[PDB]
Amino acid sequence: ARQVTIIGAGLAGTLVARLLARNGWQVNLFERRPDPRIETGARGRSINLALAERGAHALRLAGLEREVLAEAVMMRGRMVHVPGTPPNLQPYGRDDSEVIWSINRDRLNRILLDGAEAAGASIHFNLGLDSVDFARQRLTLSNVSGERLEKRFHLLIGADGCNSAVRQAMASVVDLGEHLETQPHGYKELQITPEASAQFNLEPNALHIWPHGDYMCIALPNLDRSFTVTLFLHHQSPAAQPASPCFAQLVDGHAARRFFQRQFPDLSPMLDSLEQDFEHHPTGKLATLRLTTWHVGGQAVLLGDAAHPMVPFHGQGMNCALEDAVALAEHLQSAADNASALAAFTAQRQPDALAIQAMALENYVEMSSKVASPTYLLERELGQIMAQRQPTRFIPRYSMVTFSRLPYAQAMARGQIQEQLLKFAVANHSDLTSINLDAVEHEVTRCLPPL
Template sequence: MGSDTGSPRRRELTLIGAGLAGSLLAILLSQRGWKVTVYERRGDPRIKGYESGRSINLALAERGRHALRAAGVEDAVMGQAVMMRGRMVHAADGGLQLQRYGRDDTEVIWSVHRADLNITLLRAAEQAGATIHFHRRLHTVDFDAGYARLIDDRDDQPHDIRFETLIGTDGAGSALRGEMVRKAGFGERTEFLDHSYKELTIPPGPDGEFRIEPNALHIWPRGRYMCIALPNDERTFTVTLFLPNHAAGGTGDPSFASVRSGAEVRALFARDFPDALPLIPDLEQDWEHHPPGLLGTLYLDRWHLGGRALVLGDAAHAMVPFHGQGMNCAFEDCVALADAMDRQPSLASAFAAFEAQRKPDAAAIQAMALENYVEMRDRVDDPAFLLQRELERALQQRHPQRFVPHYTMVTFMRIPYAVALERSEIQRGILVEATRGRTDLAGVDWDALAQVVHERLDVLEDAR
């Protein structure tokens, strides 16, 4: 690769943020011979323990696993992951239904705990040669001069550094993005959902084992709100309750405005999630000590300043968590950026190529994540939706190279998100048309439906 400036120091990179994307990118770039230095505002989680209370468990899918394989850390991560075969839907009447994600156990997702994953990646980054500095919060950047000031919040001491190129992997609240926006605008906008979340915990049972089915993502859909639970390898479940910030007029739905105390959340669970209530012995304490987390979608017109600075992952395109793709998308970003840096003659051209490739895909998964929230909280127990799912599986079996379910494309394959969205919209139209007015699939004209599928959908190349 050529040089942007002719400087022999161009093989040095400074990353802001040592979370999941930052530590994975540090591995990939260190393996390619870059001298990588990472600055992180928090303390080292391997020493001081990990911040908790606002960390939805992570669903690792094929895109993320591919990135971990590229970094050589998949085995270490998968040793701590718990398989989830599908959604275990807890109906309001106490009934249970497992809705599989795929056809069999080759098509599953994996629950991973953010802290465990971060620690694994940090160790691997240092082993690959990266240098990581903790307690260094980015304060200001002079992009023209190549200087940045970082602050140690323990004593408010400044630490000035010189840099060639900054890459922001510091999450939705990215300090580097803030500096880039001040420098060049970027059209930054965040659209907040009218819902927030709180994290709770189901501990192991008296026998030290899982209290409920471990190999599923549990979901309690209740219309405009819901509760989910993801398993951890220490036999706990991370529970996340999603509520509106304010109740819609006249609905009587609970909200963060109406459920404020431990007593009020206990009453809510007793009414709407009665089978979950005895599983969460510290419900009141968790509720009162964990602040609610905001849910929003971040949009930027640009992701880079020439070859001087770039943001990726949540720092560039934060999304709501309802498709389980935030981490997977960020990890895919890391691989795409490393590949672009391998191919392009300069960092400026690599950053531009990366942005051109990934921006449409980021916009697509952001849209699909918003849509999936409505599905999770309000459609998973709807008869019309379930019939469409049944037809979807039947068409997949009959036309495996053409009719590939939406969830399969997003989760078990690596086709571009934008392609998955385009095909999903076409397929949804077919499903809605074919099931309109039906209560079952009896009498479906499969030959006529096959013609529609062949006319509207091209053969899809398998990109697993």
């Protein structure tokens, strides 16, 4: 009676499992990793994520928001660390009282798994999808230890991440028209201990950034006052500058230390285990991957990172994946057949995914310049003034993405109109006093309707 098989008990897969099982679907969820709810003496290396209104609202629909927020650290603003000034807290939003939540990935995953099982989903861990035969609707799963399993499916949901095996298998039965846009930046995950964070008075209730042009660090807080730090830096040196910093040069921990002490002097002292973490934590790859479609008939569909890998510079990948899960469950529950459901899900979500993929790419330059043209600065100055005058019409794209549930595609479209307005108003002006705010405001209401 309405059967579904989900590959990937990650963020999207576990949430859609709950929503469907809730609705009376027979749900089986297969996961390559062990069950994180089985307590061990290990301590999780806390990947932590920014949870925004979008993501929170998706959890709210599933009745899990309260539980997740109880284990999330409130970030009331962005702490920018740049040389020559003390830490600069930029309160989020307008009233200076919007927030973003920092949630440990594993804690969130545990809560979602309990939610799925509570709803009736059956979860099987330590089983990795190897292949799919779409003519027989058969799956082949394996473990590096315990071995081989063949299973039929009725409907298959690929929630199996940026390297989706389901996506790989689908490419045969439909042209996905995939295009990968590789990212010159890699990333490295590092840690600040509770001890060091207190010693240097690092603010727990904020998102911290250390901008440095073509490379940067960010840090998100944990409940225990530790911070998870991410370094974004080129894999290799580029043609135009063959000796600029990159991972290729940082051949060991001592090299990494030299790099931090020079380029991030206030951060380095806080990274006690920099050498170890650097050598034992693998260097991550970033990329944007776009598909023309996310489903094969009514047989299988992709969502979350499986459907739309994006660069992490907007902190929205998880948020988008949770939104996807809600949308997929809604379509599966209102459709003439599964094929129509999957096509309608794709038509709804694919434009939104394209929009956040593009917006995330652009968000990099915003975070990490702190070298900005006076034109860019004047544009920002003007945009804040416009938001003040017309709070209902002019909403900074970042706020639309982060603090509202307006569809990504709409946020991009309005952001584009706002961008045009500002640039034409600011062009060939040295400063703000030459700008006629009245003329500019007139254009905001002309070109920008209320939501």
